[PDB]
């Protein structure tokens with residue numbers, strides 16, 4: 429925390445291929461729900477925000493090597509990831525969906541409906557992790573969701589598997605695609621920090637709980653707590 | 654109203670400062686509390702100064718009707734009876750009556766019925782007063798200010814005080830010779846009171862409230878999921 433203030437910025441790592449959380453706008457800028465969160469934390473620390481955009485699967489390792497301060501990148505909290513990083517309070521709820529081409533009679537509803545099919549995923553995601561559990565699925569793994577979608581649009585893969593909110597945003601810009609399934613999991617997004625940075629995490633959870641407090645709730649707290 | 658409040662340069666808010674923690678007098682002689690803060694937000698959002706008028710609780714409605722004040726923000730319960738003569742904002746707090754007694758007696762009433770044959774102190778014109786007055790066998794003694802209602806209990810001249818849960822807690826908190834002996838005996842909601850004709854002021858107040866109840870998180874969600 430003191431070190432972040434010396435440096436004069438909070439260094440946040442994300443992969444900007446995940447609207448509406450992180451993504452590239454028409455002018456070339458990284459924007460989204462997570463970008464806003466990150467600005468808030470920075471401002472509340474009295475420092476500037478510095479964003480680095482990288483491969484999603486590389487986020488944890490570069491947190492662990494001190495190349496970034498924190499991960500804000502639509503990252504699902506998982507028992508597995510908890511082995512190596514710490515998570516803030518949850519800040520969003522989503523789950524996996526299956527995206528396919530519109531001009532197709534293909535409409536899978538379950539993971540099992542993908543046995544025999546070629547499914548595109550972002551490497552290291554919970555999408556990746558679930559489909560990897562079924563041996564019948566030909567899993568095709570990409571760094572960026574941008575390429576997973578090109579692969580589906582051209583018909584070389586039969587589906588993309590990815591988080592519901594982001595699936596909706598990609599389908600809105602790609603009328604050739606449709607979400608064929610219901611939500612297949614219960615996932616929550618968290619902000620990741622190194623386990624040793626316990627002050628940073630406390631502060632971040634505290635920014636998170638304030639955000640969810642109306643000025644009414646804050647006023648109640650003032651007089652009743 | 655609005656244009657008229659703006660023209661004078663100050664909002665006149667009526668309250669009774671004997672009701673912690675919505676409004677009361679602190680260590681340094683100032684009137685403070687949840688309601689005072691809320692009053693400040695209304696004033697600021699109108700672009701005017703804030704003027705608190707302390708007075709007898711039961712005097713507030715007359716005072717609003719004779720135009721000595723623009724609004725009441727004073728822990729006032731929204732009731733059908735009061736709606737005959739004034740208008741209320743949307744509710745902004747939930748509370749109900751409780752019974753407060755002396756810790757070193759042996760009397761622990763749980764319902765209003767338990768107050769039958771006892772001497773009960775209330776603030777005149779409050780929903781507390783209104784409720785105990787329904788019971789023929791309750792001996793009711795009425796006071797302008799809550800502080801005197803409590804002085805009557807602490808002196809052994811009354812067996813109980815009846816008042817709103819939250820304020821009851823705040824009083825007992827600094828009067829360890831007292832205790833709340835009942836659960837919550839009614840279901841009440843506080844509103845801001847304003848003259849029926851001042852519908853522009855009522856509309857505005859409601860949209861300050863609506864908005865004080867809105868979280869940055871929710872705003873952010875609307876921003877990215879429109």
Ligand SMILES: NC(=[NH2+])NCCC[C@H](N)C(=O)O
Pocket residue numbers: 442443444445446450484501502503504505552553554555591
């Ligand atoms: N490009 C991204 N920001 N992807 C993040 C979402 C992936 C999924 N929620 C996970 O934690 O694995």
Ligand SMILES: NC(=[NH2+])NCCC[C@H](N)C(=O)O
Pocket residue numbers: 668669670671672676710727728729730731778779780781817
């Ligand atoms: N001193 C006060 N501000 N009293 C207001 C509370 C009285 C009760 N809620 C009522 O509306 O009748």
